[PDB]
């Protein structure tokens, strides 16, 4: 349980460290977006391969929340996961700052809304981004399906990439409270930050819902859970 917590901590540090790091600079969006979308996507696919078998590789409070309301983890693990993810992100952002030249640092890729995008619109965008994202996670993590899944780590990563390919122009694509938080608390700037917690969380909730439950073919959700009684009985 504590190995998984460490997994979530290191994966979040790496995720944020590489995601933010690859986002430093500018552009109008053209190749900037493609590159940042791929960096985050590949950072996730990499980390999900790295620690997915150890903790499920949530590296995202919204994703963990999704799994909580989905009743796949305890209220205890969830909170520890989010704690590990939040400190993990901050550290990665920190280590990133320490090794990156100023001028290039900018606002450490702080998630930001586009001037012509209202915070309400931006929150709906963040919701759809996280919704398709979580939906892909639930469907691909689902033990009750496919032998033609290929790598679920890549699927999930490419889902994240998709979220960025679309979302960056609108909100820089948060899809992850922890990833938005890290840049926020280190630059002392929480302008519109509410968008980056609310959207993913609601989107994550809708995805978990839209998909759920581990009903009605059931079966390994039942046997994975009779052993959770036998280890407690």
């Amino acid at each position: 349980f504590w190995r998984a917590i460490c997994a979530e901590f290191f994966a979040s540090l790496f995720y944020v460290f590489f995601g933010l790091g690859a986002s430093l600079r500018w552009a109008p969006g053209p190749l900037h977006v493609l590159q940042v979308a791929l960096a985050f996507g590949l950072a996730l696919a990499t980390l999900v391969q790295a620690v997915g078998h150890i903790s499920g590789a949530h590296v995202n409070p919204a994703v963990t929340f999704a799994f909580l309301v989905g009743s796949q983890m305890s209220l205890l693990r969830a909170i520890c996961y989010m704690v590990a993810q939040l400190l993990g992100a901050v550290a990665g952002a920190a280590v990133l700052y320490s090794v990156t030249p100023p001028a290039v640092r900018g606002n450490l890729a702080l998630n930001t809304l586009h001037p012509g995008v209202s915070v309400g619109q931006a929150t709906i965008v963040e919701i759809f981004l996280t919704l398709q994202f979580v939906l892909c996670i639930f469907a691909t993590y689902d033990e009750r399906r496919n032998g033609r899944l290929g790598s679920v780590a890549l699927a999930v990563g490419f889902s994240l990439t998709l979220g960025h390919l679309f979302g960056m122009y609108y909100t820089g694509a948060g899809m992850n409270p922890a990833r938005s938080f890290a840049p926020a608390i280190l630059t002392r700037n929480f302008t519109n930050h509410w968008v980056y917690w609310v959207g993913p969380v609601i989107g994550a909730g809708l995805g978990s819902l839209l998909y759920d439950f581990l009903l009605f073919p059931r079966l390994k959700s039942v046997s994975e859970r009779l052993s959770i009684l036998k280890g407690s009985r």
């Binding site: 009743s71 439950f213 059931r218 039942v222 046997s223 859970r225 009779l226 009684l229 036998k230 407690s232």
Partner: protein
């Protein structure tokens, strides 16, 4: 008569509430006190997988059916011993750690001995590295 006291307190540990049944609702309470909040539906599925009434209410004797007979079929102690012999390749009353890994790897799960060793010497009485009948019941009835 020590089994008649062990099969009292190994039920009393879960029936603090006196009515003489383990219900799906208290399978929710124990998990809620342990800081979870399950789905409620898949408490019925895991119990009706064994439940003789189909009822989700596992009374004083039916809890001992659920741990020592493991079917809906009155005296399945011999069906526990033939369910041992589906896993064995001899039938010597004892399921080896190796025999458990043989039948698990027969479903294609290519796993290790080291994550079955932890679920034999969680309760192993004779130390030997196989699992006898009374050890198997007590390895689901720790007290």
């Amino acid at each position: 008569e020590e089994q008649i006291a062990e099969f009292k307190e190994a039920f009393s540990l879960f029936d603090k509430d006196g009515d003489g049944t383990i219900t799906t609702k208290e399978l929710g309470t124990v998990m809620r006190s342990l800081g979870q909040n399950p789905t409620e539906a898949e408490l019925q599925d895991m119990i009706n997988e064994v439940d003789a009434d189909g009822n989700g209410t596992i009374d004083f004797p039916e809890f001992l059916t659920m741990m020592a007979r493991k079917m809906k079929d009155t005296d399945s102690e011999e069906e526990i011993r033939e369910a041992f012999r589906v896993f064995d390749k001899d039938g010597n009353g004892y399921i080896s750690a190796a025999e458990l890994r043989h039948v698990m790897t027969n479903l294609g799960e290519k796993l290790t001995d080291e994550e079955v060793d932890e679920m034999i010497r969680e309760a192993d009485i004779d130390g030997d590295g196989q699992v006898n009948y009374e050890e198997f019941v007590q390895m689901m009835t720790a007290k």
